[PDB]
Amino acid sequence: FKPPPRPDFGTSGRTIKLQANFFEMDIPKIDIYHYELDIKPEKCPRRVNREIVEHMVQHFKTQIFGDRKPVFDGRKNLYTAMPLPIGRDKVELEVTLPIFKVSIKWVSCVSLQALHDALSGRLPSVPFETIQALDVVMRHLPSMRYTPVGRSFFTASSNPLGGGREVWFGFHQSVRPSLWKMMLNIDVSATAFYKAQPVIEFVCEVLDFKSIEKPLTDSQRVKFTKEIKGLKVEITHCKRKYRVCNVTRRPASHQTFPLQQESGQTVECTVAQYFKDRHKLVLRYPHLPCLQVGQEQKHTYLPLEVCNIVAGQRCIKKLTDNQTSTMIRATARSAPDRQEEISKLMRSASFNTDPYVREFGIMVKDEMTDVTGRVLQPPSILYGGRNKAIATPVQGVWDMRNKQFHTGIEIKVWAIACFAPQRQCTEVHLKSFTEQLRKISRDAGMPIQGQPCFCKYAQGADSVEPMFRHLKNTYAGLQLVVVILPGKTPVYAEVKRVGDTVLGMATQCVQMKNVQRTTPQTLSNLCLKINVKLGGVNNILLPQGRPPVFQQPVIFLGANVTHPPKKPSIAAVVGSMDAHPNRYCATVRVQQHRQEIIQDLAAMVRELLIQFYKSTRFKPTRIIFYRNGVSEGQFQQVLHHELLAIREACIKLEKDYQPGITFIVVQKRHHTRLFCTDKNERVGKSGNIPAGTTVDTKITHPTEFDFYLCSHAGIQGTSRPSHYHVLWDDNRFSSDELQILTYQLCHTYVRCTRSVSIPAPAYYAHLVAFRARYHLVDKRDHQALAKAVQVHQDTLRTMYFA
RNA sequence: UAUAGAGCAU
Asked: Distance between CA atoms of A384 and A445, rounded to whole angstroms?
């Protein structure tokens, strides 16, 4: 269960000069002394812990600390570059700030030399405790100077998004090990916050009011409840922060709570009356509801006009479609621009003048690390038809002009369901849309032979299922049902649910805007999905020139767990069903809320292996498992439970079936940025690195098998190079063969003629989980939730998720 | 239609 070492360094590809947002750290050889803080009371905010620790350092600078500048991680860990005048014995002391008891005890020394030795690769594993200590040193001053959020820092600059939310600009910071060097990783980040403002103004923005002008309808009140629930408020009629648990149904003039009088008897008092008697405040908006704060037992109700949303709360609830576009537009930066913003950050951070960094004798190089990348050459894409045409990706893109599908599918009986009113979508429109899909159809090797046999408009999600039940029975061999949607509507969720999991009909929805104004590229892309949904093969990797792994039966898997913002989490595993590889079967499960480990993985892998054996007649000798987005924190847990589950599936099939397992974690959510050193290598308006750029040196793991591969062309903003970490490899891949293999798999994604940012199986796993969300639509029996996700027997064999 | 892109613990 220990990750394998790096087997070698790749040599394939054209060398390219690069810079990464990794800055070398010169670490002294000293020992760090580690002290544990016990602060009473506990579970104060990390900030107050810092202020408590802050004042303590000056008082006992005379007695305890002196001229040393200790660093504090909040919570309970304090570090010094110099041992404190404290015997191993504990010291209990008192800190008062506008009363806290604090006990200091030595815990350990951190040997920076041991880190030096582990970076040489000599030690088997880098000491995690030394890396933690360095991280606390580097972010001590930023933590005091800004509002920390995860490993990022933010501050006050308006960048509105509407609905009460703002986008804040900050930066990410983390210390990371590489070969022979510790690195500081710095990046610009931007996240959504709630604007600090009176709650009265919050309801306006959440409910679109011009101004506060009576009562809330059930509609308005339940919407405002979702927006504010969980957010923290501060009191103004007295500075006192509460958490909003709920928004009362009754208005402040009629909401009551039990109040104990001078005598022992308790009475019901309205919130409005109480604020008249106890605070001499006549509520200005008595018709608006209250906020229920604190424990349910106390009946703590706060009128809206007395609370502010507390400044600094990071928005985690999902953003509306418009807010998302405004944040994306406002945060996208071209690769060259991002490099400059990082350079500015390093200048203003001025780490080499941070007194805490200098206290510990640390220096940070101000230039980005130079790394040589290798641009891998892309695969050739083999198409079908009489030409047998071979596309060659250029800058991560190709097209399908003068080429047709490898295995095109005759569409002899299909038809159109229009859910947009015919004033919007007219009969002339449908045929004006159908006539051009025909041309792009037959051109592309998938010929829609004739007209749409049935063409009936309608509205209503209840209309969805009956219409479909009508069509499957009456039209023999009805292959495809095209559906037309008028903007966002729950009909979409019902169309997939019915077709995917009920009747088992190939479904293809098209926005109403795209039928009226037709693009050949949009039509062509529309055929990519249609053909696959009907069982076709759009194209295959050029058989020759595939990596040697294809000499023996191999199955490729992609695993993914998507979580809700308690709603259940969704696990998805897809598996290749041929040697191309192009066709994938899907398995999906619902599991506990927010659990990263795929609980039912063993049964899912077993199902996929059986399907592979039925489709090919071969038992895979090798299992290549692409696992999406598990942080390093959970490598050991995820690997332990999921690597054993994979083996369990093979042994459960056949006592002595033991194919080689390669376990690879795939990570887009990191802060590694790569920039071309030479301007001639920039691709596009965004100026990113070329598709195929691979880095496995200089900024990678000191001993383990990991590499960055930017398989895609950067279109908007700065590219995210995908990171791949081999946690297990029975098959002893060379660095070259695994990188090339991973790159070629990024060219087998059927939705577009472009190399995508992750391999098709990992991308399909994301789609299969994503589609299961719409399957779960309602209008919570866990046996019934597993039922709403299980797909029809007709569809499951085919890639319905495309 | 789709890739990419900011983020996604009283």
From this structure: 8
